[PDB]
Amino acid sequence: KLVRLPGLIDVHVHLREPGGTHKEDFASGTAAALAGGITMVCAMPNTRPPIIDAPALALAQKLAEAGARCDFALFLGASSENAGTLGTVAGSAAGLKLYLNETASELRLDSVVQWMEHFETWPSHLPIVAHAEQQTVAAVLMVAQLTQRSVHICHVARKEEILLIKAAKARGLPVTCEVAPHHLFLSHDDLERLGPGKGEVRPELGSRQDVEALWENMAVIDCFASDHAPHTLEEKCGSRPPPGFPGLETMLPLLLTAVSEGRLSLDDLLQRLHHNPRRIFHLPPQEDTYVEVDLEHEWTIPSHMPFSKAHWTPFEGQKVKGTVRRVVLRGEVAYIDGQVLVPPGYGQDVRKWPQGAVPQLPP
Amino acid sequence: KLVRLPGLIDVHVHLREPGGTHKEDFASGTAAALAGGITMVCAMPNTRPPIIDAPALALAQKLAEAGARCDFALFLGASSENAGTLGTVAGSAAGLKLYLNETASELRLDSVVQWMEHFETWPSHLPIVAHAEQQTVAAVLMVAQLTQRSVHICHVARKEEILLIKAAKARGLPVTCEVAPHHLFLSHDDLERLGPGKGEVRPELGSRQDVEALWENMAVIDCFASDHAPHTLEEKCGSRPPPGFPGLETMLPLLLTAVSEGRLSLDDLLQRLHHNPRRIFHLPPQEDTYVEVDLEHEWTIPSHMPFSKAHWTPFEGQKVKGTVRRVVLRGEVAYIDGQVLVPPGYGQDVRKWPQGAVPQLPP
Ligand SMILES: O=C1C[C@@H](C(=O)O)NC(=O)N1
Ligand SMILES: O=C1C[C@@H](C(=O)O)NC(=O)N1
Ligand SMILES: [Zn+2]
Ligand SMILES: [Zn+2]
Ligand SMILES: [Zn+2]
Numbered sequence: 095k096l097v098r099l100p101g102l103i104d105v106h107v108h109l110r111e112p113g114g115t116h117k118e119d120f121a122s123g124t125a126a127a128l129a130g131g132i133t134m135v136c137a138m139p140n141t142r143p144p145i146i147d148a149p150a151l152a153l154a155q156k157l158a159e160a161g162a163r164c165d166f167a168l169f170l171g172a173s174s175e176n177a178g179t180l181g182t183v184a185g186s187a188a189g190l191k192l193y194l195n196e197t198a199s200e201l202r203l204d205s206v207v208q209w210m211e212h213f214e215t216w217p218s219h220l221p222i223v224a225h226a227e228q229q230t231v232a233a234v235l236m237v238a239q240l241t242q243r244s245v246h247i248c249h250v251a252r253k254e255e256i257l258l259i260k261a262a263k264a265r266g267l268p269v270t271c272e273v274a275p276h277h278l279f280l281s282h283d284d285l286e287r288l289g290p291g292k293g294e295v296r297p298e299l300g301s302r303q304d305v306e307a308l309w310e311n312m313a314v315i316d317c318f319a320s321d322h323a324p325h326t327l328e329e330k331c332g333s334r335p336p337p338g339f340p341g342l343e344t345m346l347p348l349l350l351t352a353v354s355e356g357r358l359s360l361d362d363l364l365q366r367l368h369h370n371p372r373r374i375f376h377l378p379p380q381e382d383t384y385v386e387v388d389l390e391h392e393w394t395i396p397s398h399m400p401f402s403k404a405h406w407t408p409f410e411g412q413k414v415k416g417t418v419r420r421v422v423l424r425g426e427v428a429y430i431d432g433q434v435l436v437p438p439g440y441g442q443d444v445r446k447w448p449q450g451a452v453p454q455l456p457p
Numbered sequence: 458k459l460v461r462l463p464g465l466i467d468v469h470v471h472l473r474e475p476g477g478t479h480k481e482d483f484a485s486g487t488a489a490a491l492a493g494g495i496t497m498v499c500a501m502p503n504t505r506p507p508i509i510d511a512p513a514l515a516l517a518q519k520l521a522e523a524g525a526r527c528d529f530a531l532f533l534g535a536s537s538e539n540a541g542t543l544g545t546v547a548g549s550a551a552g553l554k555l556y557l558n559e560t561a562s563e564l565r566l567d568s569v570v571q572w573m574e575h576f577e578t579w580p581s582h583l584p585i586v587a588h589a590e591q592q593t594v595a596a597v598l599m600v601a602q603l604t605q606r607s608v609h610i611c612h613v614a615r616k617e618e619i620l621l622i623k624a625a626k627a628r629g630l631p632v633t634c635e636v637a638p639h640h641l642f643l644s645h646d647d648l649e650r651l652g653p654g655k656g657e658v659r660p661e662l663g664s665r666q667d668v669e670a671l672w673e674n675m676a677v678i679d680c681f682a683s684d685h686a687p688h689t690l691e692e693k694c695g696s697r698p699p700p701g702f703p704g705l706e707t708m709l710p711l712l713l714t715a716v717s718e719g720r721l722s723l724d725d726l727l728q729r730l731h732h733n734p735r736r737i738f739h740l741p742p743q744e745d746t747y748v749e750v751d752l753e754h755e756w757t758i759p760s761h762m763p764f765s766k767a768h769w770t771p772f773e774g775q776k777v778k779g780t781v782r783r784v785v786l787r788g789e790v791a792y793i794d795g796q797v798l799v800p801p802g803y804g805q806d807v808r809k810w811p812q813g814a815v816p817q818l819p820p
């Protein structure tokens with residue numbers, strides 16, 4: 095017998111369109127999402143061109159509306175030039191993304207003062223998420239306190255980071271965070287198998303002690319999110335390997351395996367892939383939407399999953415238990431046993447739904 | 458201009474039917490809910506007869522389906538006789554309620570061993586909430602740890618209690634809690650005005666220091682919930698005053714006043730009256746459901762609100778800013794400017810909706 099789950103939400107995916115469509119596009123990345131039991135995705139802005147201004151957002155919105163097979167919201171990206179310019183379009187985005195460590199020149203911020211300017215100008219009711227590693231977590235938390243608002247920390251990967259966030263929560267500070275599956279299910283012990291190119295990811299794979307600290311501190315983790323970051327094998331194995339792993343198709347099977355082993359409960363999983371994503375990002379419900387999983391099916395992850403154009407996976411060879419059998423999205427069968435049955439363009443921008451606007455006080 | 462809020466959820470109401478219908482019934486109590494911007498309520502089991510067995514739950518379900526004007530779920534109550542007997546009906550309830558301090562003989566538990574028996578036998582995926590004051594909070598937390606599951610603490614009212622829960626959360630323990638408006642907006646300073654009969658409530662009104670501690674520790678409060686506990690003025694002013702305040706019609710106006718004063722944000726309010734109730738109790742979304750409020754309207758709370766049969770209020774004379782103008786419930790206008798426009802029986806048991814079952818692992 096199957097277990098019915100609600101429509102799961104992945105708040106951190108890179109779908110590569112516009113500009114990197116050999117790595118993934120909206121159609122292939124949302125097929126991967128559906129096959130992973132994900133019915134809503136929030137897409138990051140580090141595309142080509144990057145989503146750092148209103149014209150780029152308008153283009154990305156149309157490409158997503160035409161290509162997405164599941165529902166979505168699109169992040170805006172902070173740049174060294176756009177603070178104070180996004181007010182008209184801010185509410186149409188998933189939130190604002192700050193890249194505070196390595197990134198493309200276009201999203202690079204050169205000074206903490208530029209972080210402050212974004213925290214001061216971005217509407218105070220709308221989400222801000224940050225790629226912030228190691229001491230950068232503490233630094234961006236300080237900026238958030240100076241500007242008296244919340245922040246969400248992307249892909250927490252280290253004991254150091256989860257304990258800092260734990261200490262901030264103990265002081266009542268408004269901070270939430272997410273953890274990606276590779277930081278729960280891979281470690282330095284896997285680098286020999288992966289090799290130095292495939293193994294490149296940011297944040298990097300942690301030690302066994304980092305992984306054990308994230309599990310021990312599950313109560314501190316608000317969301318799981320894949321950081322689906324597809325690149326082709328040629329790129330990962332070449333001379334300048336880009337960081338990132340594909341992850342939409344493997345995230346839920348890995349976590350269902352952990353549920354079956356008693357490492358966390360089904361409820362713990364649903365808080366982190368459904369309820370907390372909804373409440374942190376004010377994402378709306380999806381009517382008549384659910385996912386049926388088979389928790390008894392044992393399988394081994396292959397060298398590539400069927401849908402992502404990345405056409406490789408760092409989880410190859412891992413034994414999992416749990417698999418997505420059927421997905422229904424807004425009353426239509428979207429996925430059954432390896433077949434996606436909704437076309438490109440079936441998905442919608444949830445921020446355009448009446449229930450998908452972030453509530454705010456009047457002017 | 459009005460602000461659109463989602464359908465708010467009150468996880469702690471006493472609607473008095475069956476058996477106390479001069480105090481309130483499903484029809485009057487859910488009218489009060491709608492007028493307060495509440496579209497879903499969870500009704501407590503200390504009725505007459507109390508909802509402590511399958512026949513009593515079946516009766517209450519039919520009375521609620523026939524009388525409720527907003528959607529609902531019904532709690533089961535723990536008794537000294539029913540542990541291990543509720544398995545067939547448990548999933549149809551909001552959760553299990555434990556009355557661990559004063560209550561009716563029928564819901565009284567005489568030993569902590571009886572609490573353990575309930576924690577051991579009630580299905581582990583379903584909610585347990587407790588009326589647990591002062592050291593009882595620590596005691597029920599110990600039982601929850603011994604049985605390796607979560608607990609939700611009702612109406613936290615004291616500095617002592619919120620700090621204990623804060624310490625438990627810092628240790629990663631699975632505990633959530635709610636706070637009622639009277640413990641945020643009334644104190645010992647109001648007892649002279651209220652008098653000793655009207656002022657009777659459990660948990661009792663706190664000191665100014667208790668109130669200030671709850672506000673200071675807002676980050677620890679997961680939900681607001683009214684503990685709507687209607688009794689008539691004759692009862693409150695008579696020789697054996699029953700404890701409790703009506704609160705559905707005043708909760709949102711009081712909290713909107715606090716939002717307008719910057720004491721908490723609109724988001725803080727919506728986490729506590731919408732998102733966290735959903736996720737702790739696995740309550741489903743309500744399609745095409747929303748509440749429109751006017752945040753600029755100043756008014757003074759009168760001697761009784763229009764709908765509750767309690768026909769009195771302890772907040773009489775308080776100045777508030779914010780008022781419910783319109784409620785839409787599942788596509789129908791349910792309330793406009795003092796008129797309820799859905800009949801008794803419009804409301805439904807959300808636990809019977811496919812999306813309203815609590816997910817669980819198979820047998
Ligand atoms: O910060 C990032 C971004 C991402 C990408 O490839 O877009 N991949 C990563 O590994 N880290
Ligand atoms: O515990 C309770 C229950 C309630 C009631 O009247 O049912 N009223 C109270 O004041 N405390
Ligand atoms: Zn990142
Ligand atoms: Zn993220
Ligand atoms: Zn990323």
Ligand SMILES: [Zn+2]
Pocket residue numbers: 372373376377727732
């Ligand atoms: Zn929301």
Ligand SMILES: [Zn+2]
Pocket residue numbers: 588611612659660
């Ligand atoms: Zn109580």
Ligand SMILES: [Zn+2]
Pocket residue numbers: 468469586610611612635682
């Ligand atoms: Zn309660």
Ligand SMILES: [Zn+2]
Pocket residue numbers: 469471501684686
């Ligand atoms: Zn109560």
Ligand SMILES: [Zn+2]
Pocket residue numbers: 364369735736739740
């Ligand atoms: Zn749920």
